[PDB]
Amino acid sequence: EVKLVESGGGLVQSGGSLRLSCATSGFTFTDYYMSWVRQPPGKALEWLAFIRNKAKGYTTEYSSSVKGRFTISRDNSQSFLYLQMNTLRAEDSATYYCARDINPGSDGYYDALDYWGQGTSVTVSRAKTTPPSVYPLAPGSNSMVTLGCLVKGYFPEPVTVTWNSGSLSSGVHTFPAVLQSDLYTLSSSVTVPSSTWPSETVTCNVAHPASSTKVDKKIVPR
């Protein structure tokens, strides 16, 4: 099974540097070109660079937008792909994806980016890291009931929310974060049969990797 997992995303001050990684498994790494693609919040995908396979001498190419500024490399012994990013700007803020590129020497060569990691997020900003406050949303006072969590005042993005450790997935809405005064706020709602709450527990799980915050907040009536 082909697997690609990006890491190293985070908050970085303008002009600073940051190096992402992409761990791979489930295929002969050195046989394949590898690419990095990125996506600013709400914008289009942008191809940034690739590095060729062993037969091709592991040579590199870059898009105009990052050439001279980013460096793509690979470690063929631990099967890692890297991207060193320098002199960072606000416009470099995005989710960065590593993607398996072509093996032109393969009898099954087809030209495309066929496997993509889940992406690692990067924010380029002078603002300070701030953990979220997580507050329960219970009705003050039929059939279904809607509960929620309010995740307030954090920086930077992202945060993740699940309910009962993912075992509640249907009936969930997690709203896109909104930025205000250098601080994000987002909410999540979950809707369950009133027969199952509060007789059964409902808990939201909130993580904020930039501050290593992990929270479980039980929604109790009141």
Binding site: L45, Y110, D111, A112, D114, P139, G140, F175, P176, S189
Partner: protein
Amino acid sequence: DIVMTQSPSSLAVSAGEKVTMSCKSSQSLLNSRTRKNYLAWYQQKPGQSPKLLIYWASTRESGVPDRFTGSGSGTDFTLTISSVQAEDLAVYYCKQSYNLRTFGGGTKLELKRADAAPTVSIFPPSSEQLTSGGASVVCFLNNFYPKSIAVKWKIDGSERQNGVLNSWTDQDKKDSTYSMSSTLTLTKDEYERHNSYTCEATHKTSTSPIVKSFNRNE
């Protein structure tokens, strides 16, 4: 410098209908020797990574349903989806790989469904927030269609305008509805000066506002 552009930027279609979207390249993506066009289409569903649909202009990736058809040659290319499903909601990107790789700007495909009234829930501030001097009141408006809606907050009958932050989800991949969240943030001092807190939703499915409230002195 191959420039990719796509059309339309966005559109909406009812389930079971046919969708045609277009991709143009500033130069030919065709290798005359091999007869291959270096053009691929990717699907990106909300909150997911991009997924490969088609490569070489017309070859379907394994696992991809045949309602997805890729055609075209040289500089002009077309992705067609017949009998669109609700799950097909996504941004669709074409990408040249003839000279390095360049992505188009994408086409946002949305789905038309019957109108649906929002389900509105209001939530008072938690005692844990209050204990720190702040007071947020939240309003969820869930599973409506169409997207267009307006929420008014009223404090003791009068509209409050500032302190309000709003957010809309992407379309639901299942029921093709939208949802919205509206949060009113006050200091504990402000919140304690008033009693009635009201969230009012304006949507074409109802001639009068859809209201939820609570009283602080409840």
